[PDB]
Amino acid sequence: VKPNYALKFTLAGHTKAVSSVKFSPNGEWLASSSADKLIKIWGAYDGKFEKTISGHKLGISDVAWSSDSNLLVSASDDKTLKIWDVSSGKCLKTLKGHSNYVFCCNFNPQSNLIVSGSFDESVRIWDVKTGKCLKTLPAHSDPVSAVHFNRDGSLIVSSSYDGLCRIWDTASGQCLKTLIDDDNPPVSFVKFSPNGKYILAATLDNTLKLWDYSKGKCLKTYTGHKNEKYCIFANFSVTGGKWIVSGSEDNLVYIWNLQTKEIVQKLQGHTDVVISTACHPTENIIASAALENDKTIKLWKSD
């Protein structure tokens, strides 16, 4: 099969570059973070604006949802993370500890924990209820690009400009695995597959890679896009055909066939680098976001 994504809506509102877009686990909403220091919520199916959330002192590089679609966590250059009640827009907690910009964040599946990654080279695990830092991992020797929990929260995967992807035991804080291929390009993003068996990693040499975690081996490689300067989000699209989706520094969204590694579609519309892509939990919908010269989020749909 091949996808046939088409633009349906363009969401406008941010006054500066958009950094991350994420659909609610319930499928109803889309949250967006930006260098304008705000988070905005939008309807996932119509792109209708819903609300704006504020409080950060500096720009936000990432946002993440709780499993019940009720809470959101944000990561900022103000060196803090914030948890928010989406229904009210109120900040429930401000997590402090990082000594430099917080770049990435995610809740575990139970959503009692939040994992964070910073330019301070650390990965931290926090208690959502109290805001306390439960553990600080000396994870890398360079800025941490991404952090993600597996399906049961037993593991955390991390990536860095140091060229490494590492897997950690949530409970112990021990490093269970370090993955690296032949070359050591900086790693700009990482995430577990939805079944937790595989890991998708992006490197700043215009390459995406699929890894079997258990075997510690690279199974697939995806190329064609441009990615050498920015930490762009990538995803597994599993609602229809099995695709790998990513942003690109050529202003396009790329979609590849997971098995053949062929590019099946390139989505044109943005006027600047596509920094983030998100795939809808149940429908064949992709959300895409772009940098300063564009400032828009776009919603695409396929059969």
Binding site: K16, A17, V18, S19, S20, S34, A35, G59, S61, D62, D77, Y101, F103, Y161, P186, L204, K229, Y230, C231, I275, L291, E292
Partner: peptide
């Protein structure tokens, strides 16, 4: 900021 490029 993720919106700013790597030097």
């Amino acid at each position: 900021m993720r919106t700013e490029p790597r030097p």
